[PDB]
Design a protein around this motif. Structure first.
Motif, PDB file in Angstrom:
ATOM      1  N   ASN A 207      45.487  37.601  42.365  1.00  0.00           N
ATOM      2  CA  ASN A 207      46.000  37.320  40.942  1.00  0.00           C
ATOM      3  C   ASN A 207      46.341  35.435  40.927  1.00  0.00           C
ATOM      4  O   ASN A 207      46.758  35.266  39.778  1.00  0.00           O
ATOM      5  CB  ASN A 207      46.950  38.185  40.638  1.00  0.00           C
ATOM      6  CG  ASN A 207      46.780  39.434  40.205  1.00  0.00           C
ATOM      7  OD1 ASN A 207      46.094  39.888  39.435  1.00  0.00           O
ATOM      8  ND2 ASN A 207      47.075  40.433  41.456  1.00  0.00           N
TER       9      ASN A 207
ATOM     10  N   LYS B 218      49.201  39.209  36.068  1.00  0.00           N
ATOM     11  CA  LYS B 218      48.025  39.992  36.970  1.00  0.00           C
ATOM     12  C   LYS B 218      46.758  39.445  36.024  1.00  0.00           C
ATOM     13  O   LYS B 218      46.483  39.548  34.672  1.00  0.00           O
ATOM     14  CB  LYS B 218      48.316  41.137  37.123  1.00  0.00           C
ATOM     15  CG  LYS B 218      49.604  41.630  37.662  1.00  0.00           C
ATOM     16  CD  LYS B 218      49.611  41.197  39.079  1.00  0.00           C
ATOM     17  CE  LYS B 218      51.118  41.207  39.729  1.00  0.00           C
ATOM     18  NZ  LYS B 218      51.011  41.195  41.214  1.00  0.00           N
TER      19      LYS B 218
ATOM     20  N   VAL C 273      43.943  41.110  37.659  1.00  0.00           N
ATOM     21  CA  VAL C 273      43.012  41.906  38.161  1.00  0.00           C
ATOM     22  C   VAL C 273      43.829  43.434  38.471  1.00  0.00           C
ATOM     23  O   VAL C 273      44.989  43.268  38.812  1.00  0.00           O
ATOM     24  CB  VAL C 273      42.413  41.525  39.565  1.00  0.00           C
ATOM     25  CG1 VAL C 273      42.194  42.582  40.667  1.00  0.00           C
ATOM     26  CG2 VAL C 273      41.259  40.416  39.507  1.00  0.00           C
ATOM     27  N   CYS C 274      43.038  44.187  38.218  1.00  0.00           N
ATOM     28  CA  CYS C 274      43.695  45.728  38.425  1.00  0.00           C
ATOM     29  C   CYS C 274      42.482  46.601  39.065  1.00  0.00           C
ATOM     30  O   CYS C 274      41.322  46.256  38.897  1.00  0.00           O
ATOM     31  CB  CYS C 274      44.224  46.394  37.429  1.00  0.00           C
ATOM     32  SG  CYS C 274      43.496  46.621  35.663  1.00  0.00           S
ATOM     33  N   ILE C 275      42.935  47.929  39.583  1.00  0.00           N
ATOM     34  CA  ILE C 275      41.832  48.645  39.986  1.00  0.00           C
ATOM     35  C   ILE C 275      42.185  49.965  39.771  1.00  0.00           C
ATOM     36  O   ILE C 275      43.399  50.295  39.486  1.00  0.00           O
ATOM     37  CB  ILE C 275      41.744  48.372  41.624  1.00  0.00           C
ATOM     38  CG1 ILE C 275      42.876  49.004  42.414  1.00  0.00           C
ATOM     39  CG2 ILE C 275      41.446  47.193  42.039  1.00  0.00           C
ATOM     40  CD1 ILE C 275      42.896  48.699  43.838  1.00  0.00           C
TER      41      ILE C 275
ATOM     42  N   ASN D  87      47.802  47.993  40.736  1.00  0.00           N
ATOM     43  CA  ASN D  87      47.801  46.549  41.266  1.00  0.00           C
ATOM     44  C   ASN D  87      46.439  46.621  42.297  1.00  0.00           C
ATOM     45  O   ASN D  87      46.317  47.613  42.998  1.00  0.00           O
ATOM     46  CB  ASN D  87      48.573  45.961  41.812  1.00  0.00           C
ATOM     47  CG  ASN D  87      49.579  45.067  40.880  1.00  0.00           C
ATOM     48  OD1 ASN D  87      49.190  44.140  39.999  1.00  0.00           O
ATOM     49  ND2 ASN D  87      50.732  45.775  40.435  1.00  0.00           N
ATOM     50  N   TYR D  88      45.997  45.413  42.326  1.00  0.00           N
ATOM     51  CA  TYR D  88      44.899  45.133  43.307  1.00  0.00           C
ATOM     52  C   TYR D  88      45.476  45.608  44.691  1.00  0.00           C
ATOM     53  O   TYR D  88      46.431  45.139  45.151  1.00  0.00           O
ATOM     54  CB  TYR D  88      44.220  43.657  43.459  1.00  0.00           C
ATOM     55  CG  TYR D  88      43.240  43.579  44.434  1.00  0.00           C
ATOM     56  CD1 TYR D  88      41.790  43.841  44.166  1.00  0.00           C
ATOM     57  CD2 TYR D  88      43.449  42.890  45.493  1.00  0.00           C
ATOM     58  CE1 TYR D  88      41.073  43.582  45.314  1.00  0.00           C
ATOM     59  CE2 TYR D  88      42.740  42.588  46.437  1.00  0.00           C
ATOM     60  CZ  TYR D  88      41.222  42.870  46.411  1.00  0.00           C
ATOM     61  OH  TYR D  88      40.517  42.752  47.674  1.00  0.00           O
ATOM     62  N   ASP D  89      44.586  46.111  45.526  1.00  0.00           N
ATOM     63  CA  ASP D  89      44.670  46.391  46.991  1.00  0.00           C
ATOM     64  C   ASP D  89      43.678  46.718  47.660  1.00  0.00           C
ATOM     65  O   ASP D  89      42.817  47.669  47.356  1.00  0.00           O
ATOM     66  CB  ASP D  89      45.776  47.904  46.822  1.00  0.00           C
ATOM     67  CG  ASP D  89      46.259  48.325  48.289  1.00  0.00           C
ATOM     68  OD1 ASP D  89      47.208  49.085  48.467  1.00  0.00           O
ATOM     69  OD2 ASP D  89      45.814  47.718  49.215  1.00  0.00           O
ATOM     70  N   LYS D  90      43.500  46.080  48.735  1.00  0.00           N
ATOM     71  CA  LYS D  90      42.113  45.936  49.417  1.00  0.00           C
ATOM     72  C   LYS D  90      41.602  47.203  50.224  1.00  0.00           C
ATOM     73  O   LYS D  90      40.554  47.767  50.266  1.00  0.00           O
ATOM     74  CB  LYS D  90      41.963  44.939  50.522  1.00  0.00           C
ATOM     75  CG  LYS D  90      42.895  44.966  51.348  1.00  0.00           C
ATOM     76  CD  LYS D  90      42.835  43.665  52.294  1.00  0.00           C
ATOM     77  CE  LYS D  90      42.288  43.902  53.679  1.00  0.00           C
ATOM     78  NZ  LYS D  90      42.487  43.070  54.724  1.00  0.00           N
TER      79      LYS D  90
ATOM     80  N   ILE E 224      40.592  49.709  47.131  1.00  0.00           N
ATOM     81  CA  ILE E 224      39.480  49.376  46.383  1.00  0.00           C
ATOM     82  C   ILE E 224      38.285  49.517  47.408  1.00  0.00           C
ATOM     83  O   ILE E 224      36.962  49.870  47.010  1.00  0.00           O
ATOM     84  CB  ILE E 224      39.298  48.005  45.865  1.00  0.00           C
ATOM     85  CG1 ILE E 224      38.167  47.815  44.889  1.00  0.00           C
ATOM     86  CG2 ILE E 224      39.212  46.960  46.846  1.00  0.00           C
ATOM     87  CD1 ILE E 224      38.129  46.667  44.014  1.00  0.00           C
TER      88      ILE E 224
ATOM     89  N   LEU F 171      36.707  47.865  40.154  1.00  0.00           N
ATOM     90  CA  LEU F 171      37.703  46.382  39.725  1.00  0.00           C
ATOM     91  C   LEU F 171      37.526  46.339  38.473  1.00  0.00           C
ATOM     92  O   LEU F 171      36.594  45.976  37.941  1.00  0.00           O
ATOM     93  CB  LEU F 171      37.005  45.386  40.620  1.00  0.00           C
ATOM     94  CG  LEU F 171      37.947  44.129  40.566  1.00  0.00           C
ATOM     95  CD1 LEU F 171      38.756  44.333  41.413  1.00  0.00           C
ATOM     96  CD2 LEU F 171      36.816  43.037  40.861  1.00  0.00           C
TER      97      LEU F 171
ATOM     98  N   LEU G 193      37.394  39.195  46.628  1.00  0.00           N
ATOM     99  CA  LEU G 193      36.943  40.763  46.838  1.00  0.00           C
ATOM    100  C   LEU G 193      35.992  40.925  48.137  1.00  0.00           C
ATOM    101  O   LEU G 193      36.240  41.656  48.817  1.00  0.00           O
ATOM    102  CB  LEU G 193      36.176  41.280  45.636  1.00  0.00           C
ATOM    103  CG  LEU G 193      35.868  42.832  45.819  1.00  0.00           C
ATOM    104  CD1 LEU G 193      36.967  43.650  45.968  1.00  0.00           C
ATOM    105  CD2 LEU G 193      34.854  43.387  44.527  1.00  0.00           C
TER     106      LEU G 193
END
Length: 288
Positions: free
Chosen positions: A113, A173, A175-177, A186-189, A192, A198, A221
């Motif tokens: 973010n 933020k 980005v969200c997933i 929240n984004y978490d590799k 995702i 995404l 990403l």
């Protein structure tokens, strides 16, 4: 996938007269100076004829910070002002924006973010109150070889409307997933990598064309999830125009194995003429 994704300029600058005035009280002589700046983006109220959110700079941009919610989104940047016009003109704009992009990159791999920013280069003639400025918005694709194949997705969203609200609440933020329960988080590799959905907070209003900032987030990403090939990308807007895409990472003229990824950078704003060149504003009325 059918089309190769193309992009729209991220923002349209407007430097209010109060910006240049605060400038004149925060500049020095020294050969230059860098000042931090903060702009709050209003993605809910964008002029009708606009193709992107305004980046609206004022005296307050120099300050510590007051946004009036919901979804005013704070965006950090800075201004680099040159003591003399010749140095403004001599500056290598490409190498300059490339650094700036690198900073976004380094920030982005620590927190996705944070991989977006803006810079203003300028020269203020404090005698003739004429101001030269050029806004750059570092947009990068790393590696430079990556493109994205897309075809329309009818929806499989978090539902656009749930994303809209999530972004309103999480104003810092971009980005969200979706997780396994199809909940927006929240984004978490790690998540995702598995769920492959995404959503990006878009700043363009151009129909079916996302903001160029998208390249920044995709670069992060692709670094976090090197094996990701096909995923779903939701382009979220606070108006009527959100859309969804089936996305495939593709590659043009790829670079050798375990060589270190170069990075393609763009984002200098075009001027009134539609040309890649600085803008000039004359404030002679700061005498009479």
């Amino acid at each position: 996938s059918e089309r190769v994704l193309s992009y729209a300029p991220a923002f349209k600058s407007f430097l209010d007269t109060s910006f240049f005035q605060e400038l004149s009280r925060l500049k020095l002589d020294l050969d230059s100076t860098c000042q931090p700046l903060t702009v709050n983006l209003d993605l809910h109220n964008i002029p009708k004829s606009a193709d992107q959110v305004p980046l609206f700079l004022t005296n307050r941009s120099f300050e510590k910070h007051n946004n009036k919610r919901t979804n005013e989104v704070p965006l950090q940047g800075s201004i680099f002002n040159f003591n003399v016009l010749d140095e403004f003109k001599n500056l290598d704009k490409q190498l300059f924006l490339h650094q700036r992009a690198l900073e976004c990159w380094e920030d982005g791999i620590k927190d996705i973010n944070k991989c977006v920013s803006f810079v203003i280069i300028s020269f203020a003639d404090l005698k003739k109150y004429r101001f030269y400025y050029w806004l750059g918005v570092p947009c990068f694709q790393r590696p430079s070889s990556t493109v994205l194949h897309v075809r329309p997705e009818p929806s499989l969203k978090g539902l656009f409307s749930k994303c809209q609200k999530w972004f309103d609440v999480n104003y810092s933020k971009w980005v969200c997933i979706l997780d396994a329960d199809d909940e927006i988080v929240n984004y978490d590799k790690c998540i995702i990598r598995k769920t492959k959905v995404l959503a990006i907070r878009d700043t363009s209003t151009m129909e079916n064309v996302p903001s160029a900032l998208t390249k920044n987030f995709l670069s992060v990403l692709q670094y976090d999830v090197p094996d990701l090939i096909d995923f779903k990308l939701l382009i979220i807007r606070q108006n009527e125009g959100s859309f969804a895409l089936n996305a495939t990472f593709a590659s043009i003229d790829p670079q050798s194995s375990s060589s270190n990824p170069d990075m393609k950078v763009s984002g200098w704003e075009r001027n009134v003429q539609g040309k890649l060149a600085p803008r000039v504003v004359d404030l002679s009325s700061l005498l009479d």
